[PDB]
Ligand SMILES: COc1cc(/C=C/c2cc(O)cc(O)c2)ccc1O
């Protein structure tokens with residue numbers, strides 16, 4: 001899995017399930033080109049976003065729709081979304097896990113980057 | 117001060133000093149318009165970005181240049197920047213403090229929103 | 233103020249007000265001796281816990297009563313408390329700010345250490 | 349797995365491998381009784397700490413030796429250890445994953461609690 005995203009709920013102590021996100025890749029004109037998307041599973045994980053051959057050097061943005069997640073729980077959150085912007089594959093392929101821990105007024109994110 | 121940003125360094129246990137950031141506001145055509153910018157002080161704080169009159173309802177993005185901060189310390193970090201996107205003042209004027217806690221592969225961010 | 237603690241609420245986007253905490257110092261017999269205690273103010277800050285003369289080298293524990301805070305809001309939280317254990321002043325006098333960002337099932341904590 | 353601990357390194361973007369920890373359970377005299385222990389694997393995970401039958405209601409403390417982890421990397425960290433103190437199994441068995449994200453001057457922790 002070249003790119004996986006895992007989302008956790010800090011209020012309820014659970015995976016954040018059915019969280020939608022889009023992934024973009026920065027184009028030469030500095031616009032954000034659509035790249036991948038999906039929703040987290042019952043484990044809070046989104047696998048299968050891309051393949052090693054398609055996932056080359058670039059600046060990538062994961063835009064996680066945290067607002068819809070909190071709204072469905074009756075909570076008015078601070079952020080429009082949580083976004084994670086990073087350069088990937090600049091030294092050749094790596095495997096990336098992006099984790100996000102969500103609260104209504106806060107989020108934390110980290111990356112685990114592994115060499116295949 | 118209707119908007120203040122405070123940035124902390126989780127590696128060195130210090131304020132994150134001289135961190136550049138840019139604030140944008142979403143325009144009617146869904147474009148990000150430049151709104152304000154500045155650098156954190158010796159306390160890790162950036163004051164004076166805007167005024168009560170100028171800080172109208174809208175969707176704002178604070179883009180913190182974490183990459184340059186880490187690179188100046190000899191660290192090749194994961195993120196291009198740490199960004200915070202939020203609706204402001206849609207229920208009347210509020211004061212916002214955005215805090216960010218930085219590590220090379222991770223960041224946490226929260227908001228303190230107060231009604232004056 | 234050689235030691236200050238600041239506590240923030242990630243659910244409500246506010247300082248965590250009236251949060252009790254107890255500070256202990258490790259005794260020569262490896263027991264935790266009571267050192268100081270107090271409650272956060274309306275700003276989420278607790279000042280005046282100790283003095284430069286009293287805050288000698290040692291191992292200190294700050295135990296923040298997060299459980300009572302959440303229970304007063306009707307939330308059954310995960311942790312009994314958030315605690316921070318650290319050696320202080322072993323290279324000479326320093327000023328310490330301990331910050332904690334609270335959610336029902338999660339907390340983040342950092343330290344800002346400055347040389348006066 | 350009734351109790352699993354996962355530890356991540358926010359400086360290097362990797363699992364925190366070979367991190368030692370002890371688990372204690374509060375006794376009737378308010379002393380901390382030894383309960384379980386181990387070291388994280390190459391995935392940053394420590395499995396097999398306990399069994400469902402042995403893991404009953406109590407207050408548990410996971411004490412993670414983060415200081416030795418940072419010292420081995422030549423880093424002088426803030427905390428003596430990271431500790432996570434929580435009541436478990438008060439409503440009967442649950443499965444607990446404790447995650448900790450480590451930086452030299454900061455840590456974040458969350459719990460994922462699932463009903464079998
Ligand atoms: C708002 O003013 C302050 C915030 C903080 C720390 C905020 C913080 C701490 C964390 O552990 C995580 C996080 O995302 C934010 C410290 C001193 C301040 O004066």
Ligand SMILES: COc1cc(/C=C/c2cc(O)cc(O)c2)ccc1O
Pocket residue numbers: 006008097099100101108109110338354356445447448449456457458460
């Ligand atoms: C539980 O499983 C996993 C948790 C995480 C990340 C947890 C985490 C992330 C943060 O940004 C902050 C925090 O306190 C905890 C990553 C991979 C996993 O498989």
Ligand code: NA
Pocket residue numbers: 090091092
């Ligand atoms: Na390269």
Ligand code: NA
Pocket residue numbers: 206207208
């Ligand atoms: Na309105």
Ligand code: NA
Pocket residue numbers: 322323324
């Ligand atoms: Na000394």
Ligand code: NA
Pocket residue numbers: 438439440
């Ligand atoms: Na019960």
